[PDB]
């Protein structure tokens, strides 16, 4: 998934 | 437990012309999410019109370049100042790399120069010394981003002659040093956008029969  | 390896990021790119070769590499050095240096060159003139870069784990990269440079020096002493041909350098590096087959140098190695016929040559090596002469090779973190672009623009892959019903391929031809440097600059700006370990600066070493010239270009610093 994506992270920030 | 102590891990002897690390990843210093960055990416390198070698392209071979007709009577020249370029070896380009970004000047960014990183560990994890921290920038170590914005200008740490990893493309070196090793003499005898050979330029070399060992991208990946900088410690192993510097160690290898150092050992090869020393190998060139002792080649002169032992063989009456004879010039080390790019093909001979490539085989010598295989032996340096494979010597550590069971404790490998963690690097993607590219050398560039001229063959004994005066034509542009690029050799690329896997971490354990398997090597192959090519017109084109990207190495390091952003290799997977740049390489398919080079396939399309240098070797003209998947490109067919318009209106030939995809039957006649776009013909292979040598690129000018001007056209090659455009692709290198656009490869690195594209790589800088989409890869976090690539940016800061671009250093290109151009090899002609006249010798080794350098060019530097700014990249985005985020």
């Amino acid at each position: 998934f994506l992270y920030x | 437990q102590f891990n002897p390896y690390g990843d210093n990021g960055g990416t390198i790119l070698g392209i071979a012309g007709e009577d020249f070769a370029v070896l380009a590499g970004d000047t960014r050095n990183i560990t994890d999410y921290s920038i170590n240096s914005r200008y740490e060159p990893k493309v070196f003139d090793c003499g005898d019109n050979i330029v070399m870069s060992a991208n990946g784990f900088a410690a192993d990269g510097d160690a290898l370049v150092k050992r090869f440079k020393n190998s060139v020096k002792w080649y002169h002493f032992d063989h009456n100042d004879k010039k080390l041909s790019i093909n001979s350098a490539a085989r010598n590096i295989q032996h340096l790399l494979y010597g550590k087959r069971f404790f490998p140098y963690y690097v993607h190695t590219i050398i560039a120069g001229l063959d004994e016929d005066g034509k542009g040559a690029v050799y690329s090596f896997d971490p354990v010394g398997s090597y192959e002469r090519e017109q084109c090779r990207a190495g390091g973190a952003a290799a997977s981003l740049i390489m398919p672009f080079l396939d399309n623009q240098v070797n003209f892959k998947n490109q067919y002659e318009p209106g030939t019903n995809g039957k006649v391929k776009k013909p292979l031809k040598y690129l000018s040093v001007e056209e090659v440097i455009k692709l290198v600059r656009d490869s690195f700006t594209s790589a800088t956008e989409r890869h976090i370990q690539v940016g800061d600066g671009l250093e290109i070493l151009i090899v002609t029969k006249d010798g080794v010239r350098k060019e530097f270009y700014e990249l985005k610093r985020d």
Binding site: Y3, X4 | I30, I35, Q153, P162, D186, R194
Partner: protein, 222 residues
């Protein structure tokens, strides 16, 4: 990611970067990490991108229903209490690290929420991978009784520290200013210091370059 919150005399200001990443690759070059819980309660998210959006959207909904039921403008402590009770229930499995800020009848507020359900109070806060770069700037330049224009400058400077020095952070600076007795102003793309330089070359292909096997009209109508 680099999200900061700064308190000034008549309000609170939150700012965030615009970079979203999968592994070392940049998925979104310009993504908004500032979320509206309520018209005067805004939140900046770091950690699992999906989790931060979802948890903010869910509480934002429950706060609106609570506001309608009580015939009162929502309070920051309500959003905070509902968030930290929800996050605690899931024992950190919801990877949402939030800076909650807003104005309400009670006054101006600035909090930080962690995935495990812990909460902090402060005049200046920083969350995400670039927090240490941001907090360095905040610790160096922050003072008591900041003006609006000083707080925006400090907040955007703290984000910039992350953009340049942290690999996880980059691109632009989003800002939201929540001042008492005024509508909150959402300054999307307040700073765009990472504009892509003109490419060396247009890669617009001659029409017919791609080889085609079949064509067909697709029916989208009934």
């Amino acid at each position: 990611t680099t999200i900061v919150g700064v308190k000034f005399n008549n309000g609170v200001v939150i700012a965030a970067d615009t970079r979203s990443t999968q592994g070392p690759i940049v998925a979104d070059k310009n993504c908004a990490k500032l979320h509206r819980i309520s018209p005067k309660i805004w939140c900046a998210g770091a950690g699992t991108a999906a989790d931060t959006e979802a948890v903010t959207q869910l509480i934002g909904s429950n706060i609106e229903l609570h506001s309608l039921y009580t015939s009162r403008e929502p309070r920051v402590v309500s959003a905070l209490q509902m968030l930290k009770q929800h996050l605690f229930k899931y024992q950190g499995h919801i990877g949402a690290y939030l800076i909650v800020a807003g104005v309400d009848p009670t006054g101006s507020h600035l909090f930080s929420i962690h995935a495990h359900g812990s909460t902090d109070v402060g005049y200046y806060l920083s969350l995400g991978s670039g927090s240490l770069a941001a907090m360095a700037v905040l610790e160096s330049h922050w003072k008591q009784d900041l003006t609006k224009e000083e707080a925006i400058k400090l907040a955007s400077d703290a984000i910039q520290a992350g953009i340049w020095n942290d690999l996880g952070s980059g691109s632009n600076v989003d800002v939201c200013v929540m001042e008492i007795g005024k509508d909150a102003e959402y300054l999307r793309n307040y700073l765009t210091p990472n504009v892509r330089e003109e490419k060396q070359k247009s890669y617009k292909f001659p029409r017919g370059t791609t080889a085609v096997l079949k064509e067909s009209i697709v029916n989208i109508c009934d």
